[PDB]
């Protein structure tokens, strides 16, 4: 809360130089993304918290009740850090510490293993990967 500028994000160090008559920075979308701390004269850079998408890989409900979950477009080491109470919108963080993680170009999927033979595509994952329910 800087001089009435309420928001939410993470504050870092920035090298961009502000003239003495400037206090706020802006971008193309015309939203503030750089402020000056009103007690020192240092410049801070505002960027939002980590966000993304979640997909669920499931066979038929009658066939089984076991699933796999994909985190779209994230380096696979980002999500284990965020495993704490009142820190992730989905509350089922137990799954993140589940089965072995395989990293793909669409993000790493948890709960499914990675064989290296070839089959026909069953459930298309993305960028040349397909998941299936086998023995």
């Amino acid at each position: 809360n800087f001089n009435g500028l309420k928001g939410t994000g993470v504050l870092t160090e920035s090298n961009k130089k502000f003239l003495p008559f400037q206090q706020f920075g802006r971008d193309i979308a015309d939203t503030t993304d750089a402020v000056r701390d009103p007690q020192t004269l240092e410049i801070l850079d505002i960027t939002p918290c980590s966000f993304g998408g979640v997909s669920v890989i499931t066979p038929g409900t009658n066939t089984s009740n076991q699933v796999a979950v994909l985190y779209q477009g994230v380096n696979c080491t980002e999500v284990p850090v965020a495993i704490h109470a009142d820190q992730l919108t989905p509350t089922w963080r137990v799954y993140s510490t589940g089965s072995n993680v395989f990293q793909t170009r669409a993000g790493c999927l948890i709960g499914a293993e990675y064989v290296n033979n070839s089959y026909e595509c069953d459930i298309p994952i993305g960028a040349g990967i397909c998941a299936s329910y086998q023995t």
């Binding site: 500028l5 015309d30 939203t31 503030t32």
Partner: protein, 48 residues
């Protein structure tokens, strides 16, 4: 002769070019659109 003709001018691959331009020029107008007020006091949601 075909290999040089393809790389001769910048309008050879025009049909595949406006396909990728129209799909990225349409995204910029979406982003720039949220700086408007639509008759409100301000375009920023928190200060209202």
């Amino acid at each position: 002769k075909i290999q040089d003709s393809l790389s001769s001018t910048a309008s050879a691959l025009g049909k595949l070019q406006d396909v990728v331009n129209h799909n990225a020029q349409a995204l910029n107008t979406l982003v720039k659109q949220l700086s408007s007020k639509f008759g409100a006091i301000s375009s920023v949601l928190n200060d209202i």
